[PDB]
């Protein structure tokens, strides 16, 4: 989960800079604007990275976080940590909902005179390689992990169906 997290949040910052510097720089979630305004690729990075860091539906980091809450969801945990896991990951998802419902949602409201530019091989190549890797990196890390223990893998109802 450290490796995967590195990919995902590195993506998220390295896009957020595209937002900021592209905007001049306000870097406040107020103002901001909608998703697609000459910003296709950065916003794509933001629902790859956002949708990613949500805990993933089935995507890469899922190979970390979901397994984590499965095993931690079970056995001898003092059990104050289970609810902790649940509402924790949930409020992570709601962070994502925040940054979409503000930065990506409403029609543009912010200091006028659009200066925005996405055109430059440096960014597109950067975020490019990081996302191409990200979705395919967590999958290599997935089943190349020489087995170090017994996975739960027998997961009861209501202790299984609560991750997603």
């Amino acid at each position: 989960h450290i490796c995967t997290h590195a990919f995902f949040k590195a993506m998220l910052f390295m896009c957020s800079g595209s937002i900021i510097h592209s905007l001049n720089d306000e870097q406040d979630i107020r103002k901001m604007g909608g998703l697609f305004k000459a910003m296709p690729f950065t916003t794509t990075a933001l629902i790859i990275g956002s949708l990613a860091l949500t805990g993933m539906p089935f995507l890469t980091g899922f190979y970390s976080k979901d397994l984590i809450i499965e095993s931690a969801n079970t056995s001898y945990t003092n059990a104050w940590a289970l609810l902790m896991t649940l509402v924790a990951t949930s409020f992570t998802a709601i962070y994502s909902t925040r940054i979409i419902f503000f930065a990506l949602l409403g029609q543009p409201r912010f200091p006028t005179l659009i200066n925005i530019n996405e055109n430059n091989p440096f960014l597109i190549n950067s975020i490019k390689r990081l996302l191409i890797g990200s979705l395919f990196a967590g999958f290599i890390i997935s089943n190349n992990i020489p087995p170090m223990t017994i996975p739960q893998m027998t997961m009861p109802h209501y202790l299984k169906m609560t991750a997603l």
Partner: protein
């Protein structure tokens, strides 16, 4: 300090906190309009004490309307800039000494710069005369800098020609 800037300040930063409140800017609009009426009924009375009273009431009622992270445009003191570039500001008295080689690196700058050195070396006597003349005893009352009547420079100029922001 006068009623003018008191009221007007409360109005202005009230609009600021209100900006920070809402979103999509339209709700901000007609709310700000209800406020526009809230101060619009005001101001038509020259009664003295009643006014400052009601104002103070708007000082508490305003102080309720402060959420802790009011929006701050970047350039003023705030979490965005307030001299991000400050390590880049080098005062013009530096470069007064570079090596004469590098002083020859850019041969024509110091030409005009020398026209400034003479501009304000020829000066400052005209300046000191005009100032020592105008100032009332001690110069207590004025923080301002009144101009020069004769053709020429405005006397306390030197620092006011500044290294610019980036």
């Amino acid at each position: 300090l006068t009623h003018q800037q008191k009221v007007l300040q409360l109005y202005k930063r009230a609009l600021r906190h209100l900006e920070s409140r809402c979103v999509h800017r339209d709700k901000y609009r007609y709310f700000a309009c209800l406020l526009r009426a809230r101060f619009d009924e005001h101001k038509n009375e020259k009664d003295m004490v009643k006014a400052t009273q009601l104002l103070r009431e708007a000082e508490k009622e305003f102080w309720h309307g402060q959420h802790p992270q009011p929006y701050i445009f970047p350039e003023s003191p705030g979490g965005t800039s307030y001299e991000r570039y400050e390590c880049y500001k080098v005062p013009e008295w530096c470069l007064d000494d570079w090596h004469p080689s590098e002083k020859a690196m850019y041969p024509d700058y110091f030409a005009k710069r020398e026209q400034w050195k003479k501009l304000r070396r020829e000066s400052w006597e005209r300046e000191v005369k005009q100032l020592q003349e105008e100032t009332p005893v001690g110069g207590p009352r004025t923080e301002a800098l009144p101009p020069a009547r004769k053709q020429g420079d405005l006397p306390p100029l030197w620092w006011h020609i500044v290294t610019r922001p980036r």
